[model samples]
Target: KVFGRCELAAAMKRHGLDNYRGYSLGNWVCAAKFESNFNTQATNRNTDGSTDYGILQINSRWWCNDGRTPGSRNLCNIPCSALLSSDITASVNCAKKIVSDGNGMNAWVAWRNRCKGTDVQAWIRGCRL
Candidate 1:
């Protein structure tokens, strides 16, 4: 899936992000690549065939009460899936919330570093945001 740069930027803006300069769009792209290979609708399947669905590979069963359904209502306001239901603007806003919340973005950075084989936290540090 193709990630929309303009949409991401606009989304970030809507979320009151004024530090876009430090973190380039390329940085966001890299992060997304690491996280979900830019797949807006990506989903993961367990060895037992259970599902972890949507961009950012959010586990529907964990994040949303209803794992079998797709869309924002089922996602329980989980940002990634909510954004996917609408647009990247929503996604970036969701991400901003995660970043502001401390645990969310930090956890994601940690996970991205472990899974994607990169220092995503270091990358954020470089951005100075």
Candidate 2:
């Protein structure tokens, strides 16, 4: 699912991405825009032999089990495929786990480079959620 800005905002808000781990909805929205552009099925293979999956691009190297990433921690205890579902619950929850791990949103380089010190609020300006 490729989501529009507000659409993704509302959906993520419903799942409590807003203010999760002290990161506002705008931060998440901005990260999603850069990471995967709100596409549910987006995937990126890293040169280190790991893959990022779904809208928030949860990594198979640590967060989820893909059976292909060696020594995966699978901290989220979910199948990597779950992240690709349009349902998004798994993706959202897994992201919470990622942030709650003490890395905060900086765990995602896209968030660090794109959302760290900017007007992230602009990402959700028109969203009523």
Candidate 3:
């Protein structure tokens, strides 16, 4: 929504998340590339009959809730819409909170399955810190 990796990286840094839960910014951006390409409005529907929200793809089942989806525990106590849109504070905060429970980046299937074990350096390449 706000362009590419630079926007995302800078935004995260402003949130004091250059390093989150011991995970590097590269880790976060790599997953973002595949998970949503930095689109704030990105949404993915999983085969489990659950919806994932925003760039980080926070799930509705345990994290946020879509008014249409009734089974969410709303672990973050935030609405799914909050994770969507150009404003990323809500999504990033919720993501940080979820990682606080110790799952780390492995909690996001995209991070584990795609972004992990790859050369993620480019996610932060040519960026002014």
Candidate 4:
């Protein structure tokens, strides 16, 4: 489905999220803002020419096998466009798995500290979308 506030909200509900920690949509948006300024198609190219792509900043080379094909699947086992797709729920779910899979949301927490300069609660309050 097309990603939007309402669609995200519904996804959160489906995922059993309640609010931020409990709310997948809110947490996803928060992560996106901190990770890539919510730029779904964003990519970062290092001096070595390696690339990171999508809102979640999944590395194009590392994650997508160094390919530039559109709609290609990445290390996350989903298409690159899925990271930028309007399917907010799918995107959020993808990130959730990454964050919770023994990473303990450390990346997300670090983003809050550096970009948000606040705790999770405050960051949630500051979220614009």
Write model 1 residue lDDT over 1-129, tens digit each, in one string: 455544443443455553542444444545565566666766566454445444444444334433454432432365324534545554564455455544534435524465344543443343323
Question: In candidate 4, what are the lDDT values of residues 1-129, reduced to their tens digit?
Answer: 233444444554466553534433455555556666665666677555656556666655434544664444465666556666654554556656556556544555435555443343443453343
RMSD of each: 6.4, 0.7, 1.3, 5.4
TM agreement with the true structure for every prediction: 0.49, 0.97, 0.92, 0.56
TM-score of 1: 0.49
**Candidates ranked by lDDT:** 2, 3, 4, 1
Selected candidate, larger lDDT, 1 vs 4 = 4
lDDT against the true structure, each candidate: 0.47, 0.93, 0.84, 0.53
What is the Cα-based TM-score of model 3? 0.92
Candidate 3 per-residue lDDT, tens place, 1-129, comes to 744788898888788767777787888888777788889899888887789989899998889988766677898899898999798899888889888878788888889998888887778999886
lDDT of 2 by residue, 86-119 (tens): 8889999999889998789999999999899999
- The worst-scoring run of ten residues by lDDT in candidate 3 lies at 1-10
Clashing pairs in 2: none
Q: Worst 10-residue stretch by lDDT in candidate 1?
A: 120-129
Best by lDDT: 2
